[PDB]
Amino acid sequence: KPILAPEPLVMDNLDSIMEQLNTWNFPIFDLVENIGRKCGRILSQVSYRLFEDMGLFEAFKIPIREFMNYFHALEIGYRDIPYHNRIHATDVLHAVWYLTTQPIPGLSTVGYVFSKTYNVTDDKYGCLSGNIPALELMALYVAAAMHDYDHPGRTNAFLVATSAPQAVLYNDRSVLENHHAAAAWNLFMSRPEYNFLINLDHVEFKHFRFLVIEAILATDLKKHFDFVAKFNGKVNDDVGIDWTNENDRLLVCQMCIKLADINGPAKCKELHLQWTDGIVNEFYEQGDEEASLGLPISPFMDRSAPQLANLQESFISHIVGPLCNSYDSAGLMPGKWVERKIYCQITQHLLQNHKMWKKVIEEEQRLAGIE
Amino acid sequence: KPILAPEPLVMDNLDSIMEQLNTWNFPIFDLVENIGRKCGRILSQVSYRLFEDMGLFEAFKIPIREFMNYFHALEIGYRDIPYHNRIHATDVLHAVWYLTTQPIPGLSTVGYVFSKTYNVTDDKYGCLSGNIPALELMALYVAAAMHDYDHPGRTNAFLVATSAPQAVLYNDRSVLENHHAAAAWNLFMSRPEYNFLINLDHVEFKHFRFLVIEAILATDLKKHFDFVAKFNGKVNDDVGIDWTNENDRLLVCQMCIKLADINGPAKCKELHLQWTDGIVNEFYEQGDEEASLGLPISPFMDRSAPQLANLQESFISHIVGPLCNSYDSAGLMPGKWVERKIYCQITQHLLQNHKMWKKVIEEEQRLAGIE
Amino acid sequence: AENLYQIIGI
Amino acid sequence: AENLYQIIGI
Ligand SMILES: [C][C]N([C][C])C1=[C][C]=C(C2=N[N]C(=O)[C][C]2[C])[C]=C1N([O])=O
Ligand SMILES: [C][C]N([C][C])C1=[C][C]=C(C2=N[N]C(=O)[C][C]2[C])[C]=C1N([O])=O
Ligand SMILES: [Mg+2]
Ligand SMILES: [Mg+2]
Ligand SMILES: [Mn+2]
Ligand SMILES: [Mn+2]
């Protein structure tokens, strides 16, 4: 039973909203409402738009039919859980596209692929698409589309503690990420109709698969500090980032996908609050399952005593904060020149959200102390 | 359909040959002939003898019935392939027991478990059993019993190149070792009758599982040089090996299981030749499968043009040689004082086998040059 | 952030 | 030992 894509591959009614694909605060939920929750074609349409903008369809002679069929199957694979659904995959794909394509102040540029929304005439800006080969960029985009495939709505710790079959299968080593990559590649290789990489040679296909698997496995938060330390050590080196080195480019792609996977706190207030609501709903479901199983309820997963503000503040200060700081210090953070200083929307939004959470925590503590 | 062990748990007819379990050149094939190839109870009987010698049955209150049932199921799991069969598992278990228990000259000793064949009165010798806790030793023995479980007779490279389902499942990352560990633990957790660790608490069971998985995954030869480099760096440090550190003990256990997995060249001439014949038969079967599939025949796997001597010489000089040298330099190699110098049977056997292979290679080259 | 690391597994 | 490393995968 092959899950073939709907006959209209391109939806014209979305052509307006896709025009806002060039801004960081993309109204993705409005796109979900426009497309419809039943069909769930958001990821396929967004991926098609991004591939057209890059031109990877003509660069690699990618067949449209196979690409659309496989991405529709990938959309079907995502479960209807509050956070790790196809909406999150679309958001991560849009974020990696934004990070790779949008101008970066002071980034020197060296086949290669450039977005149609980038101005090559200007010499004061650069983009990661001008330093990363097209094959690696396509691998990064595909991995971002595959980063959380078939997510069960549970964390790695819950699966390990409960001795879930997935945990036993992968020997309690990056259970979620390994499962996502394995399921995505099994789906890709299961049907001939999903093979949109038929025009790649044997060596290129192997390299693409390796890059996609590495990028997917980089999304694990258990190894987050390892990646952060490695990236900081590479950047602080006098040599710096070498774009002619395969390992450095792989590390840069892994950092980009890691930053895009937790980009929620770095958005505007409305998107950040909606993503926080989704993730805390998923946490509450996991905590209810833990209570049913008799295990002690994990922190922040108790619906009776929510700690949403504390969770968000800790996540921003410990996970998102250092990662964004390292990415900006490396010089890969998109921004604009102000007249010379650099203005970044992502960093400003992260600071504003962190201040909001600190204010909420202080207000809650004051209210508790009064009572 | 639980695979329950035969009603007689202990075989008396073997009690004589088990007396030779205290020597490195254990006639394992004679034991296979005595027991019988149909029943395949060699691994269970050898494991029972070793556990009785250590006393882990009384130390951890291990039930005999569950232990025997699970080890018989483990024996059944091993396939009848020329090399990676239950005979290899028994050999590796005997080798890890020999390395951990037999006296080591100059090794200082610090619950703990000592073998019944060790003289504690003498102060000039030590054993790894006196510095490694009983739980870690049991984990090492179980991992050695599980190191190559359900081996398909093919290398990691063959599985990756042919896009085997096991390779896709584990994302081309230690496919064989991950499969072995996952299958062994799934078999252990599948039936209540195989749970011989019921007397361990929750934390101890988790630590035991972690140690077993780490030891099993250490057996991969793709990461052999990584482990060798890490061990050399730890040993050459002025601090040296710290037996009070969990990480150092885990590294020592991993090195022991790695050395025991390739102990074949370190044995006497007859055992080494038999193991070489088995491994080259497995290589020839793999090469025949590669030729059938149309892939180019891998080196040393061409039955038409054998290179057995070259393969053995390369394996000894590149894999077994440096590993044995590092293990001996660390000071963990068993031996005896000669009157003060240290005599090691393992190193002498390895040198003799390497010289034999060099002589064979020189003779073959001379014969080829004459023609 | 003991609770956050416990959730992550670090 | 190019052939040995190719077999191992290094
Ligand atoms: C599954 C990963 N993870 C649970 C451990 C997680 C997912 C999403 C968010 C999250 N929190 N806030 C948001 O704004 C949306 C996303 C980024 C946080 C976590 N986390 O580590 O606790
Ligand atoms: C499967 C591991 N491996 C194949 C790559 C392998 C197994 C066994 C032996 C082997 N060779 N000689 C012997 O004496 C018996 C064993 C140790 C060698 C290899 N190898 O790396 O080529
Ligand atoms: Mg994830
Ligand atoms: Mg093995
Ligand atoms: Mn994710
Ligand atoms: Mn082995």
Side-chain angles (χ1 to χ4, degrees):
Chain A
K1 299 179 180 299
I3 305 179
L4 303 180
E7 185 70 14
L9 305 184
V10 187
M11 304 177 64
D12 297 358
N13 58 331
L14 321 174
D15 295 1
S16 59
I17 192 177
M18 299 303 181
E19 188 79 347
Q20 300 186 8
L21 275 175
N22 51 14
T23 181
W24 174 246
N25 301 274
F26 175 72
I28 179 171
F29 297 90
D30 300 0
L31 180 57
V32 184
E33 297 293 337
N34 294 12
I35 298 183
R37 306 174 186 177
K38 166 64 187 303
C39 48
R41 309 175 186 177
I42 164 186
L43 180 56
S44 292
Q45 300 303 323
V46 171
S47 185
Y48 178 85
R49 289 295 186 273
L50 296 183
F51 271 69
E52 273 198 345
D53 291 2
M54 304 312 294
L56 302 176
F57 282 145
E58 285 73 14
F60 296 95
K61 303 177 181 179
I62 300 179
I64 305 299
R65 185 70 64 181
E66 283 68 15
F67 185 92
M68 295 304 300
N69 292 322
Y70 182 63
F71 268 76
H72 183 63
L74 206 67
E75 294 170 330
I76 297 302
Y78 275 91
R79 296 183 180 180
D80 299 331
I81 54 185
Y83 180 81
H84 297 99
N85 46 18
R86 58 185 61 95
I87 327 296
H88 178 55
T90 301
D91 189 68
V92 173
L93 177 60
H94 171 264
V96 300
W97 180 91
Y98 188 94
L99 292 173
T100 52
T101 61
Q102 293 304 304
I104 303 175
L107 180 62
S108 59
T109 59
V110 305
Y112 294 89
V113 154
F114 293 86
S115 180
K116 296 178 181 180
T117 61
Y118 177 78
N119 180 22
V120 297
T121 63
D122 192 1
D123 50 358
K124 301 177 301 301
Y125 290 89
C127 60
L128 292 182
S129 60
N131 300 270
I132 300 180
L135 182 64
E136 302 185 359
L137 290 179
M138 183 178 61
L140 178 58
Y141 299 157
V142 169
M146 297 171 170
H147 68 290
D148 285 347
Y149 178 77
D150 198 3
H151 201 281
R154 305 299 178 267
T155 58
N156 275 323
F158 175 80
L159 297 182
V160 170
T162 56
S163 299
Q166 299 84 356
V168 181
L169 183 64
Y170 298 104
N171 302 324
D172 310 3
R173 297 192 62 186
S174 300
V175 178
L176 288 177
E177 290 68 22
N178 281 316
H179 171 63
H180 303 336
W185 282 111
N186 186 23
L187 179 60
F188 178 80
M189 301 177 179
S190 62
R191 297 298 301 179
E193 299 79 10
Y194 300 155
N195 184 19
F196 65 97
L197 302 164
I198 188 179
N199 297 325
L200 297 184
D201 55 74
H202 196 267
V203 181
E204 282 185 355
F205 183 82
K206 295 297 183 179
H207 195 241
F208 174 91
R209 169 179 168 88
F210 174 80
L211 293 174
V212 171
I213 291 179
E214 290 288 335
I216 291 176
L217 295 179
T219 56
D220 200 333
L221 286 178
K222 189 175 183 179
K223 306 181 179 183
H224 171 81
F225 287 95
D226 302 334
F227 281 104
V228 169
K230 179 167 55 182
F231 193 76
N232 291 333
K234 183 164 297 181
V235 169
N236 295 19
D237 188 10
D238 299 331
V239 181
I241 301 179
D242 185 11
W243 300 105
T244 60
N245 194 327
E246 180 180 354
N247 299 324
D248 297 5
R249 296 196 303 265
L250 176 60
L251 184 59
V252 168
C253 295
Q254 290 175 333
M255 267 317 184
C256 291
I257 190 179
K258 285 180 58 60
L259 179 55
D261 186 61
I262 57 179
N263 61 336
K267 298 179 175 302
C268 61
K269 183 176 180 178
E270 288 74 14
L271 295 176
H272 182 14
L273 291 185
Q274 291 176 336
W275 286 122
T276 292
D277 194 6
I279 188 56
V280 301
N281 289 330
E282 187 167 324
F283 279 178
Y284 296 158
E285 294 189 8
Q286 177 181 339
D288 294 1
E289 185 173 3
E290 293 185 12
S292 299
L293 294 181
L295 284 75
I297 296 182
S298 301
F300 308 112
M301 302 183 183
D302 191 6
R303 191 194 309 264
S304 301
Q307 291 188 358
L308 183 149
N310 307 328
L311 168 66
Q312 290 305 313
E313 193 274 341
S314 302
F315 191 68
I316 292 182
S317 57
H318 292 272
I319 304 299
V320 186
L323 182 53
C324 292
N325 181 26
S326 181
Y327 201 80
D328 181 68
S329 299
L332 310 181
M333 187 65 68
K336 291 185 177 181
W337 292 103
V338 173
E339 303 177 0
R340 302 180 63 182
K341 300 178 182 179
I342 299 180
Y343 170 80
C344 166
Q345 181 182 187
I346 295 177
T347 303
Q348 184 192 14
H349 284 356
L350 188 62
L351 293 181
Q352 291 177 0
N353 295 335
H354 186 55
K355 291 189 301 180
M356 175 187 64
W357 293 125
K358 292 184 63 179
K359 292 178 182 179
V360 172
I361 288 185
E362 291 183 6
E363 180 68 22
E364 181 177 353
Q365 288 186 355
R366 183 190 64 90
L367 181 60
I370 288 183
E371 299 182 0
Chain B
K1 299 179 180 299
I3 305 179
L4 303 180
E7 185 70 14
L9 305 184
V10 187
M11 304 177 64
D12 297 358
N13 58 331
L14 321 174
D15 295 1
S16 59
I17 192 177
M18 299 303 181
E19 188 79 347
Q20 300 186 8
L21 275 175
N22 51 14
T23 181
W24 174 246
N25 301 274
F26 175 72
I28 179 171
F29 297 90
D30 300 0
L31 180 57
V32 184
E33 297 293 337
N34 294 12
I35 298 183
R37 306 174 186 177
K38 166 64 187 303
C39 48
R41 309 175 186 177
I42 164 186
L43 180 56
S44 292
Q45 300 303 323
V46 171
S47 185
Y48 178 85
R49 289 295 186 273
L50 296 183
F51 271 69
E52 273 198 345
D53 291 2
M54 304 312 294
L56 302 176
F57 282 145
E58 285 73 14
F60 296 95
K61 303 177 181 179
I62 300 179
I64 305 299
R65 185 70 64 181
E66 283 68 15
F67 185 92
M68 295 304 300
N69 292 322
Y70 182 63
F71 268 76
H72 183 63
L74 206 67
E75 294 170 330
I76 297 302
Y78 275 91
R79 296 183 180 180
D80 299 331
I81 54 184
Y83 180 81
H84 297 99
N85 46 18
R86 58 185 61 95
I87 327 296
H88 178 55
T90 301
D91 189 68
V92 173
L93 177 60
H94 171 264
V96 300
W97 180 91
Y98 188 94
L99 292 173
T100 52
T101 61
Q102 293 304 304
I104 303 175
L107 180 62
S108 59
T109 59
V110 305
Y112 294 89
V113 154
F114 293 86
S115 180
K116 296 178 181 180
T117 61
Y118 177 78
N119 180 22
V120 297
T121 63
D122 192 1
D123 50 358
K124 301 177 301 301
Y125 290 89
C127 60
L128 292 182
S129 60
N131 300 270
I132 300 180
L135 182 64
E136 302 185 359
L137 290 179
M138 183 178 61
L140 178 58
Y141 299 157
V142 169
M146 297 171 170
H147 68 290
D148 285 347
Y149 178 77
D150 198 3
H151 201 281
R154 305 299 178 267
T155 58
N156 275 323
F158 175 80
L159 297 182
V160 170
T162 56
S163 299
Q166 299 84 356
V168 181
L169 183 64
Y170 298 104
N171 302 324
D172 310 3
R173 297 192 62 186
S174 300
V175 178
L176 288 177
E177 290 68 22
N178 281 316
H179 171 63
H180 303 336
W185 282 111
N186 186 23
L187 179 60
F188 178 80
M189 301 177 179
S190 62
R191 297 298 301 179
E193 299 79 10
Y194 300 155
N195 184 19
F196 65 97
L197 302 164
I198 188 179
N199 297 325
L200 297 184
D201 54 74
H202 196 267
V203 181
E204 282 185 355
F205 183 82
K206 295 297 183 179
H207 195 241
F208 174 91
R209 169 179 168 88
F210 174 80
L211 293 174
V212 171
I213 291 179
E214 290 288 335
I216 291 176
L217 295 179
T219 56
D220 200 333
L221 286 178
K222 189 175 183 179
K223 306 181 179 183
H224 171 81
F225 287 95
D226 302 334
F227 281 104
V228 169
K230 179 167 55 182
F231 193 76
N232 291 333
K234 183 164 297 181
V235 169
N236 295 19
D237 188 10
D238 299 331
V239 181
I241 301 179
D242 185 11
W243 300 105
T244 60
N245 194 327
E246 180 180 354
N247 299 324
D248 297 5
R249 296 196 303 265
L250 176 60
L251 184 59
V252 168
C253 295
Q254 290 175 333
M255 267 317 184
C256 291
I257 190 179
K258 285 180 58 60
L259 179 55
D261 186 61
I262 57 179
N263 61 336
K267 298 179 175 302
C268 61
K269 183 176 180 178
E270 288 74 14
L271 295 176
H272 182 14
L273 291 185
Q274 291 176 336
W275 286 122
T276 292
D277 194 7
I279 188 56
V280 301
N281 289 330
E282 187 167 324
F283 279 178
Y284 296 158
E285 294 189 8
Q286 177 181 339
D288 294 2
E289 185 173 3
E290 293 185 12
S292 299
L293 294 181
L295 284 75
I297 296 182
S298 301
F300 308 112
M301 302 183 183
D302 191 6
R303 191 194 309 264
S304 301
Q307 291 188 358
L308 183 149
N310 307 328
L311 168 66
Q312 290 305 312
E313 193 274 341
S314 302
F315 191 68
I316 292 182
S317 57
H318 292 272
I319 304 299
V320 186
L323 182 53
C324 292
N325 181 26
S326 181
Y327 201 80
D328 181 68
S329 299
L332 310 181
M333 187 65 68
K336 291 185 177 181
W337 292 103
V338 173
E339 303 177 0
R340 302 180 63 182
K341 300 178 182 179
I342 299 180
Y343 170 80
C344 166
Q345 181 182 187
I346 295 177
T347 303
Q348 184 192 14
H349 284 356
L350 188 62
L351 293 181
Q352 291 177 0
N353 295 335
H354 186 55
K355 291 189 301 180
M356 175 187 64
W357 293 125
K358 292 184 63 179
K359 292 178 182 179
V360 172
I361 288 185
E362 291 183 6
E363 180 68 22
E364 181 177 353
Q365 288 186 355
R366 183 190 64 90
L367 181 60
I370 288 183
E371 299 182 0
Chain C
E2 179 181 0
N3 295 330
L4 187 66
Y5 297 155
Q6 177 180 353
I7 291 186
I8 297 181
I10 306 172
Chain D
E2 179 181 0
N3 295 330
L4 187 66
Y5 297 155
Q6 177 180 353
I7 291 186
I8 297 181
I10 306 172

